[PDB]
From a paper:
Dystrophin is a cytoskeletal protein belonging to the spectrin superfamily and is responsible for linking the extracellular matrix (ECM)-binding dystroglycan complex to the cortical actin cytoskeleton. Actin binding by dystrophin is mediated by two portions of the protein: the tandem calponin homology (CH) actin-binding domain 1 (ABD1, residues 1–246) and a series of spectrin repeats (SR) in the middle of the protein comprised of SR11–SR17 and referred to as actin-binding domain 2 (ABD2; residues Phe1461–Gln2209). The ABD1 of dystrophin is a member of the calponin homology domain superfamily. CH domains are found in a range of actin-binding proteins and consist of approximately 100 amino-acid residues with a characteristic α-helical fold that includes a core three-helix bundle and two flanking helices.
The structure of the N-terminal actin-binding domain of human dystrophin was determined at 1.94 Å resolution. Each chain in the asymmetric unit exists in a ‘closed’ conformation, with the first and second calponin homology (CH) domains directly interacting via a 2500.6 Å2 interface. The positioning of the individual CH domains is comparable to the domain-swapped dimer seen in previous human dystrophin and utrophin actin-binding domain 1 structures. The CH1 domain is highly similar to the actin-bound utrophin structure and structural homology suggests that the ‘closed’ single-chain conformation opens during actin binding to mitigate steric clashes between CH2 and actin. There were four protein molecules in the asymmetric unit. Based on the refinement statistics, the closed-conformation AlphaFold2-derived molecular-replacement model was used for further refinement. This choice was supported by the presence of inter-chain 2Fo − Fc electron density for the linker region connecting CH1 and CH2 in all chains of the asymmetric unit. The structural model shows density for peptide backbone residues 13–244, with most residues exhibiting resolved density for side chains. In domain-swapped dystrophin and utrophin dimers, the linker Gln134–Asn137 in dystrophin forms a helix that is extended away from the CH1 and CH2 domains. In the closed conformation, the helix melts and the linker forms a turn.
Author numbering: 13 to 244
Write the structure that this text describes.
């Protein structure tokens, strides 16, 4: 349940969702389009709201300066970072590029989205509180019993139940239960979240309806849902 090709795809979809939020250009390849250090600075500009000027020049030292600026901003935001140096990003290291993007997603999409609730509940484990939120929210949906952020989501019922429990107005639950295809249920939830909740479709059905669902991708998407669903 730690799947790196799926992570490449879904993390890139999240990065481009941020860029869509700010009207900037999308990236096409996560292991090439971050090397010059510019688009990382664009992403951190969008996330921090601060201007992060780029170095001028097309040599390796300018990319290294850009990435050093990005890493200094991350450390200034108390971000939990992987063991990384600027050269690892400039030179296209796959695992550490994925790991930096995951550090960013976890800091902003997960921890920061959930920070006020966690300070209220006086809890620190983000996964425990998010799992409890899903479980309590879907307690009265009988086809749903979420115990993890992987296989509990594969048949598409838990996602539709999480959406429905916070917005019972959007659809009739029995219409989803009557869908025998987990692909149709997953697409149904994805389309609701995309067009009625403003969440980019970070996940494909095959990223969830699969033998080993990627835990980080699902956690990312579920915390984005937590970010936009009403919890009055």
């Amino acid at each position: 349940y730690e799947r790196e090709d799926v992570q490449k795809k879904t993390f890139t979809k999240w990065v481009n969702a941020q860029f869509s939020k700010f009207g900037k250009q999308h990236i096409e390849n996560l292991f090439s389009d971050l090397q010059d250090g510019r688009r990382l600075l664009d992403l951190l500009e969008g996330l921090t709201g601060q201007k992060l000027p780029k170095e001028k020049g097309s040599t390796r030292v300018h990319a290294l300066n850009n990435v050093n600026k990005a890493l200094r901003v991350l450390q200034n935001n108390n971000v939990d970072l992987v063991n990384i140096g600027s050269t690892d990003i400039v030179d296209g290291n796959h695992k550490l590029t994925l790991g930096l993007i995951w550090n960013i997603i976890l800091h902003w999409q997960v921890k920061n989205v959930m920070k006020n609730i966690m300070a209220g509940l006086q809890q620190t484990n983000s996964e425990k509180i998010l799992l409890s939120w899903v479980r309590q929210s879907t307690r009265n949906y009988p086809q749903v019993n979420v115990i993890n952020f992987t296989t509990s989501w594969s048949d598409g019922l838990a996602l539709n139940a999480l959406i429905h429990s916070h917005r019972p107005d959007l659809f009739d639950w029995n219409s989803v239960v009557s869908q025998q295809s987990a692909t149709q249920r997953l697409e149904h939830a994805f389309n609701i979240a995309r067009y009625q909740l403003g969440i980019e479709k970070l996940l494909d059905p095959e990223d969830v309806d699969t033998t080993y669902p990627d835990k980080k991708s699902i956690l990312m998407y579920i915390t984005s849902l937590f970010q936009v669903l009403p919890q009055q």
